[PDB]
Design a protein around this nucleic acid. Structure first.
Lengths: 209, 102, 113, 120, 98, 122
RNA sequence: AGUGGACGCAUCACUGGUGUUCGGGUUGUCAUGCCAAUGGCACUGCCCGGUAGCUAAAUGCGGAAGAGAUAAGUGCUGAAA
RNA sequence: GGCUCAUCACAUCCUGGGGCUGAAGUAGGUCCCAAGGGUAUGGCUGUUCGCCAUUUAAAGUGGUACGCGAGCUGGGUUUAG
RNA sequence: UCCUUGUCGGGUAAGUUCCGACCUGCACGAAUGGCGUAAUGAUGGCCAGGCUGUCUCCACCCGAGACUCAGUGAAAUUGAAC
RNA sequence: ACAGGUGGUCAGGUAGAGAAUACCAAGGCGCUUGAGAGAACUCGGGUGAAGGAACUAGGCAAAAUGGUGCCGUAACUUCGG
């Protein structure tokens, strides 16, 4: 089925009567009004475009403003689409709430994780950190060897070495769902999800069994 | 429920020649076990059968044993039922350990 | 906002207040099979970390000549009753110095109030 | 990794930083005019404004704690006597940033941080 | 062998050679010890030799290993023979056969 | 967290007093032994009249760890001094008769009911 | 069906580590006129802690289950004969 | 030579599928297909190799001018004592 | 001292290192000195107690560079290069 | 206008045995490029959960003890140590 769109708010753990601690992630997913419905005849694939939240009218770009006007919905922070899965059909302007995830009980959450800047090789691919003593000079955490001798003479692209990590799309799969609240606009999921506090993210039913 | 299972285990072990039966009460002394029953085994074959006997009546009584220890050695072996724990021991091997000091 | 409201609904409102260095008696539940007992635990608190519903404190006792340190969560159902026996008199929030000194030479006096 | 961190060090150690704003807070109060580069003035609000709101009430202990900063009897005497009553009805924002181009030495961003009125 | 009673594994395979100890290599690389092949035998097999036709030991219990043919002795390379009397270590010492 | 090349204390009347763990068990590249595991050790100090003679290598079970265990409710049980209880080589039955000091309750799921039956403290 | 070893992603809510912009104890000395109270220097003067943030040893998850065409192989019908 | 970083081939160490088996079951022996993944820590000497202790299912074999010093060390090789 | 990792014992789980014992002295040998020697040594080797980021295994923090801006402004090398 | 070398003369207070050391008096300076960013990485350091040399050729580097007063102090020995 389709997913929902929320954002990280904080971390807390829920207590059971049996005395088991379940650390959950607080996700706030409100009424995700559908902005556009796509069909095979007109678009080649069946999907619906959805938005959430409210955006200040000054920053609402005028071409964007007309887009929501056609759908009959107010402004949003973004326009993500969730694909349809052969048998559930929706209409433009329909609002979907937390109650859709009342039975999935397993979700995969994806989003833009925290950016680490220009992180080193050790922080990126967890290298083995050449010895810092026993005569070692000016090379304590450098990558070291990156290639072979006069043979071919190139480093194969895809090599693991220094670069920028984080601030990229990443998915964590099969997260246990603990509690769903529609009246209080809450989504509690066992574990941790990518992104920081307030970063936008999308949650979908788990594709695994 | 402890007294009912205590009667259920003491009767079954005695049905297959289980001698030197003493029921201990460690309530208050220790916070792990509720009741302590001790048993004597002459040698390896039948004490394993006693362990085989008690584990299969437990499966037929609903309560699932949560741990056993005796493997490739019959000097000691334990079968657990939660509140009540049975210790079937060899007579020669018991004297090395304690008797009614637990 | 939503975090704080979620914190307060699961909060425990019957936890007594104890000082960092008092002698505290705590009874902790045990989940074993189908029947549960209460475990009485002796010791003196050496550290207090009061942080929301996840507030925790560390208690230390001596058993068979060996020191064991136990931690708890104040707002958890695992603990049942936290009672203070004698009130300590120390000006340090963190009593991490008890490890180096021996027990017999590190008795804490009463607060007298 | 400077995530959710506040306060700069300006390529200067902690010993310099405390002494740096020690003079900066005192000089701003004594004269009520300053021509310093923006990063000084931008980070200047960390110290002087808490000092001014420390002068909202007059007490012996309050002045002693205020004396621990600004390292000067003359500066603290200026507080609690005129900075207090003048800013009594104002809650915060005792300083204003006024960028004034670049210096001729090394082209650093010049800025003014000043009191609202200065009573001058 | 307690978990078997078969003896056909002796007519199907009658000749076996323990691997010869590999010759020493350059860079002062010694030869790896030939892996000891274990011949499983059912309990109660008394062994006779051509020559000293006396049993080295009867097989009664399960889980014990008996040695019937000890391995040879490794050879000595020219590096071990380094000296100034010859000033040219080139002689070779072959290993004693098992 | 106890790895190779470390000396521990002894929590039974076997005879050893200062033992040094010989190799961590559990799998390939096992960095750390937990609190419920089969850790094998060697003897560095023992009473001459005891059952074990100093220098022997034999299995053991760790009972107390300085870091502690992880309770399912975010709790740890810290100790003062790592301790172990000896084992036979072929069989995992400890040889000692008494156990000194408290023992964590997480070892119930570890299937080492020798220590649980003994050690009356906790 | 569970529980583990190695690797990867997320994470600060739990256990901690750091946390020289936070508080406190203390030595020598100088200074603020002095008592008291404070500031500088001596590696942050030496230490005890610990906000946020970062992080692991801390906790959640991942490898799939499947589908199509296949190697070795096992087959049905089946003539060439 | 060690540390770091790896790449490819299959004459496959394990995992995977089968034939024969002298395959009662388990544990195995040989061969075929299969490179997707993984494919030890220590004491001794500079040692690669190797003797031993001890783990894992495994501690595979090779090529890459027997990889990699404008990456690191110089313990062997080392002019001058 | 080629056979020397000579053979055995101690030390460690494991010791081509170290110490003790056995002499089969290729090529020990008595002022180009032999045998012991307290103390002494920035002398070679080995072992033990404490200690620790040497390492398992890396994380954070403080300063000087590295990066941006402004001013001054270098060198090896270079047949020609799309 | 160089982190180098260069002989003599005078030698304050505090605590300290001291011309060591930490601060200060008179005096002399802030060392002729700075303002920002708070990445990898390089250099000098601080601290660290559990382990305590398991790394390495080698305890290399680090880390550790360190003063005063009392008691006590081994084999050997040239009687001094």
């Amino acid at each position: 089925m389709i997913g929902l769109v929320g954002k990280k708010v904080g971390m807390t753990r829920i207590f059971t009567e049996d005395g088991v601690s379940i650390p959950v992630t607080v996700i706030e997913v409100e009424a995700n009004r559908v902005t556009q419905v796509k069909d095979l005849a007109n678009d080649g694939y069946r999907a619906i475009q959805v938005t959430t939240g409210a955006k200040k009218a000054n920053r609402v770009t005028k071409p964007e403003a007309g887009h929501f006007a056609k759908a009959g919905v107010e402004a949003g922070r973004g326009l993500w689409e969730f694909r349809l899965a052969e048998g559930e059909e929706f209409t433009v302007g329909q609002s979907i709430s937390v109650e859709l995830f009342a039975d999935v009980k397993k979700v995969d959450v994806t989003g833009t994780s925290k950016g680490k800047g220009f992180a080193g090789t050790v922080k990126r691919w967890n290298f083995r950190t050449q010895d810092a003593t026993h005569g070692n000079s000016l090379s304590h955490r450098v990558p070291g060897s990156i290639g072979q001798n006069q043979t071919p003479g190139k480093v194969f692209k895809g090599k693991k070495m220094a670069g920028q990590m984080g601030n990229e799309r990443v998915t964590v799969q099969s997260l246990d769902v603990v509690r769903v609240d529609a009246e209080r606009n809450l989504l509690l999921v066992k574990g941790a999800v990518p992104g920081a506090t307030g970063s936008d993210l999308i949650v979908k039913p788990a594709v695994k069994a | 429920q402890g007294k009912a299972l205590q009667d259920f285990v003491i009767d079954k072990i005695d049905d297959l020649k289980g001698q030197d039966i003493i029921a201990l009460d460690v309530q208050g002394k220790s916070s792990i076990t509720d009741c302590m029953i001790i048993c004597t085994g002459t040698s390896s074959r039948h004490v394993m059968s006693i362990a085989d006997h008690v584990v299969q009546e437990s499966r037929a009584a609903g309560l699932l044993p949560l741990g056993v220890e005796g493997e490739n050695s019959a000097d000691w072996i334990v079968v657990d039922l939660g509140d009540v724990i049975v210790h079937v021991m060899q007579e020669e091997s018991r004297r090395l350990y304690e008797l009614e000091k637990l | 906002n939503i975090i704080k409201q979620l914190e307060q609904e699961q909060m425990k409102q019957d936890v007594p207040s104890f000082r960092p260095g008092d002698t505290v008696e705590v009874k902790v539940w045990v989940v074993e099979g189908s029947k549960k007992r209460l475990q009485a635990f002796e010791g003196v608190v050496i550290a207090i970390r009061n942080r929301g519903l996840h507030s925790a404190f560390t208690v230390r006792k001596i058993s068979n000549g060996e020191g064991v340190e136990r931690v708890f969560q104040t707002h958890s159902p695992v603990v049942d009753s936290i009672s203070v026996k004698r009130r300590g008199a120390v000006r340090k929030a963190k009593l991490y110095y008890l490890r180096e000194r021996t027990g017999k030479a590190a008795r804490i006096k009463e607060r007298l109030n | 990794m400077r995530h959710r961190k506040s306060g700069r060090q300006l390529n200067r150690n902690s010993s310099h930083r405390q002494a740096m704003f020690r003079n900066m807070a005192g000089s701003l109060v004594r004269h009520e005019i300053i021509k310093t580069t923006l990063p000084k003035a931008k980070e200047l609000r960390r110290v002087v404004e808490p000092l001014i709101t420390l002068a909202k009430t007059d007490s012996v202990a309050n002045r002693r704690l205020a004396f621990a900063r600004t390292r000067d009897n003359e500066i603290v005497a200026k507080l609690f006597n005129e900075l207090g009553p003048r800013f009594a009805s104002r809650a915060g924002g005792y300083t204003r940033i006024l960028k004034c181009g670049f210096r001729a030495g090394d082209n650093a961003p010049m800025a003014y941080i000043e009191l609202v009125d200065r009573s001058e | 062998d307690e978990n078997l009673n078969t003896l056909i594994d002796y007519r199907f395979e009658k000749s076996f050679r323990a691997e010869r100890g590999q010759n020493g290599a350059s860079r002062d690389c010694t030869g790896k010890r030939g892996k000891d092949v274990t011949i499983k035998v059912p309990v109660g097999t008394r062994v006779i030799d051509q020559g000293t036709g006396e049993t080295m030991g009867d097989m009664t219990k399960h889980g014990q290993r008996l040695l019937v043919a000890k391995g040879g002795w490794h050879g000595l390379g020219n590096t071990r023979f380094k000296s100034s009397v010859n000033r040219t270590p080139r002689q070779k010492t072959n290993g004693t056969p098992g | 967290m106890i790895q190779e090349q470390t000396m521990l204390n002894v929590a039974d009347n076997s005879g050893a007093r200062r033992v040094m763990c010989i190799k961590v068990l559990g799998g390939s590249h096992r960095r750390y032994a937990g609190v419920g595991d089969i850790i094998k050790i060697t003897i560095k100090e023992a009473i001459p009249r005891g059952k074990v003679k100093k220098g022997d290598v034999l299995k053991a079970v760790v009972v107390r760890t300085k870091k502690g265990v992880r309770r399912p409710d975010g709790s740890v049980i810290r100790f003062d001094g790592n301790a172990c209880v000896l084992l036979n080589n072929n069989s995992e039955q400890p040889i000692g008769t008494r156990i000194f000091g408290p023992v964590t309750r997480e070892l119930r799921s570890e299937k080492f009911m020798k220590i649980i039956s003994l050690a009356p403290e906790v």
